[PDB]
A paper describes a structure:
Here we investigated the aminopeptidase, P. aeruginosa aminopeptidase (PaAP) from P. aeruginosa, which is highly abundant in the biofilm matrix. PaAP is associated with biofilm development and contributes to nutrient recycling. We confirmed that post-translational processing was required for activation and PaAP is a promiscuous aminopeptidase acting on unstructured regions of peptides and proteins. PaAP contains an M28 Zn peptidase domain (residues 44–116 and 274–510) and a PA domain (residues 117–273).
The PA domain was also captured in an alternative conformation in the truncated construct, PaAP_TE340A(trunc). These observations imply that the PA domain becomes free to rotate when not locked into an inactive conformation by the C-terminus interaction. Interestingly, the modified C-terminus (thrombin cleavage site, LVPR) is fully traceable in the PaAP_T structure and binds to the PA domain of an adjacent protomer, where the C-terminus interacts directly with R189A. The interaction of the C-terminus with an adjacent PA domain aids crystal packing, the protomers are linked together, akin to a chain. A similar observation was also seen in PaAP_TE340A(trunc), which instead packed head to tail. Autoprocessing was identified by comparing intact mass spectrometry results between active PaAP_T and inactive PaAP_TE340A, whereby a ten-amino-acid sequence is cleaved in PaAP_T. Interestingly, the thrombin-cleaved C-terminus of PaAP_TE340A (confirmed by intact MS) remained as a bound ligand in the crystal structure, suggesting that the liberated C-terminus propeptide is degraded by active PaAP.
Author numbering: 46 to 516
The structure:
Amino acid sequence: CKSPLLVSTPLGLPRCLQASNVVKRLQKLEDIASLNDGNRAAATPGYQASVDYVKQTLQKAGYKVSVQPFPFTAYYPKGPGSLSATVPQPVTYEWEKDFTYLSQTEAGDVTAKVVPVDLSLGAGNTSTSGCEAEDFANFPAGSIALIQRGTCNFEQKAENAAAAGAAGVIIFNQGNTDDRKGLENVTVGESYEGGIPVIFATYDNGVAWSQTPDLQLHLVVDVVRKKTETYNVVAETRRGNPNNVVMVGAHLDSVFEGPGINDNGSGSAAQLEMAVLLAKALPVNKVRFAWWGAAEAGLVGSTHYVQNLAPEEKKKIKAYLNFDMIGSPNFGNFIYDGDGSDFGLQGPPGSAAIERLFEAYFRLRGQQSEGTEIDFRSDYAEFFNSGIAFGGLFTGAEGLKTEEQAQKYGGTAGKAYDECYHSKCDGIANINQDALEIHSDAMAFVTSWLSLSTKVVDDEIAAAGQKLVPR
Ligand SMILES: [Mg+2]
Ligand SMILES: [Zn+2]
Ligand SMILES: [Zn+2]
Ligand SMILES: [Zn+2]
């Protein structure tokens, strides 16, 4: 298993990829979570420690490593917010019924007189409340600005309040029609720079408050917000044809709620062990590995990588394999539906070939499997938009296992594939080691097979004729 002959072959690499080594790496990832507040979310020290770990492992194995940074504004709500009247009479208002956060607000604990700003009430109003600087013409600094929705963005309103000396901002719904009087999920924008907290209230509350002389509100907004950057970790073999790159990826960040050991520690740790084993391989085609950042924020890291590649470099990538959640405790054996056989949506030419390879491996291991939707749910998405052939594995998340699936893969019908999905309890004990083992083996077989010959993809591309041959 030391020798390069074993790890270079599609049946040898799975035998050399031990589930127990992946679990050791998973335990390392969970230790990183425990040592940095129980999560590995983007722009947290948990993710910084994950990057350091991935990078030093890849270097120790002999890779030149790129830690690719890209700008990222982190906003994680930490707990429920509070709103209380202190003057004239004490009144505690109900969270998610009277008021909610503006997404991308700053944190704060502010008790101040409330001053309404350019209010235009009534059914059918066309309010310009706080949209202009003159609306704050006599606004006493230190106050909480009571502002009505209308015309302009919430960001513009709150930043005007901040430039006026406001301690905090309460935006209530416009109320120009009957169903515009309640709470909504709204945003001050990723570009908000007001520095002060902003919450959202119902219309009837906003009216009452504007009509209360001497009103003072105590306002507690309990979030993390940080304009910063985060990282992708990219490394490729020094061996291999650089014009025919086989690329694998797994996103390395977690949600803020938990350690994210299955989502997506499983893909990351499996891919890392495979990369260490391939350090000593003899591929025909160059293998590139990426651990993506800020994926739980909307595929930001992988999208950044792909969009910021020179065209000359992007045409060199032949296939992308995505491994996101492959240790689900109530697992099924799901393969991306590259040919559209199940859901009618096809990948770029070559994706059906990749799918057939994954199908072949599960068949060889005496295992059933089936398709899963590929409508841009994970980090292959910008690869899809670029016309690059792709595929990947999935063991299931918040969907419920069917009876047919229960008799195919074991586990419990009627229960989620991963009941700890995006939760605090997504830790080391949430991994099904049979699922992890078999999907790591499948990852290995297909990666290695493509590392020896992309012909099945080349053939599909040639039959498509939509991207002629350049060499
Ligand atoms: Mg105005
Ligand atoms: Zn995921
Ligand atoms: Zn996720
Ligand atoms: Zn299919």
